[PDB]
Amino acid sequence: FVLLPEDAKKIWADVDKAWGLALEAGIPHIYPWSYTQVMRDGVIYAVPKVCG
Amino acid sequence: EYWVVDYNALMVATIIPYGSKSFKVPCQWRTNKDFLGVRWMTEDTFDHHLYRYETDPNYL
């Protein structure tokens, strides 16, 4: 849950870490909480750059 | 498909398209001060950054 736009890049940073634990835990269905917050912040799923 | 609505918090209204160039706005009126506004936004502030449309305030 994000709410305030000012904490988007901060909260969403921990969101990805929690997702990895869920994938490790084997959760079959995982959803983001808010459609509004997803579009407000504009989150995407991209492979991290191999630069470093 | 891109029109939006706004109204007083004491009423309920939704917008639903039903044709190529037509749409319906069912609503419920509860108070005398109810004011429903169907508006077209020049700039996009609801869609995703990859789904926004170009902004142009010139309607001449």
Added chain:
Amino acid sequence: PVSEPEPINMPTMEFYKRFLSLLHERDMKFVNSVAYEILNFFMPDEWKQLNWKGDPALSGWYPPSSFIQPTNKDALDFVSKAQCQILKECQNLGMELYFQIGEPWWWDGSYNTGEGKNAPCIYDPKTMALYKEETGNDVPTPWIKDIFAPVEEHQWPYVDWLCTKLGQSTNYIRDYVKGKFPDAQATLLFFTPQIMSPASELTGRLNF
């Protein structure tokens, strides 16, 4: 509001009729959820949970919103009848039924709630009559002024009765929905931080 079969107004129903139609085209199933929270301005006065000073439960949202008392059968029917109206559209479209019970919670003022900063809204006069009618025991006194304050020993029998009564309300709604929708699937949303780390001993013992 008691004899009305469809509590959901037409514009909301129209939105879901088109909304569910698109989902079926995308072949993704839909899950519905309704809560106990209704707008305070329109909420009936006989359903709001009352604290030790009679102030109905309120939320941090503006306009403020109240919660129904789970001990009220009439209030439970209103919420349950909302689920069947929405799920009826799903059967018309050929979808399978999925519904969620939304936040069963005895309000306690966990966060700021105006005057009721931490006052539990568990002292509704109707609830006291029901507690006396079946348990026979008297309501413990004095009424809890703050959840964080230590709980007296004689307060527990009423607290445990409230905790048990909350489970019946959730079960009652589930049975009512499945009464007309035998193939419907039921679920519930759980707050893990509240379960493991309750705000107070009273909070965890009462609302779980």
Added chain:
Amino acid sequence: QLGQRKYPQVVMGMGMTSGFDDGYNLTPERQVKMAYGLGYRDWWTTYIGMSHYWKGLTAF
């Protein structure tokens, strides 16, 4: 005609959760197609509105 961005995204195998109180203004057609394009394909959970679904009236 106005320019618009429309870039479909690869499916990540996740669902979408939305609230009615935050989507009444937008048409259902725009919401479903936009979310589907991003990659949410299997599940959808909608939280009913708090003050926008029930019937009501005002009186003196």
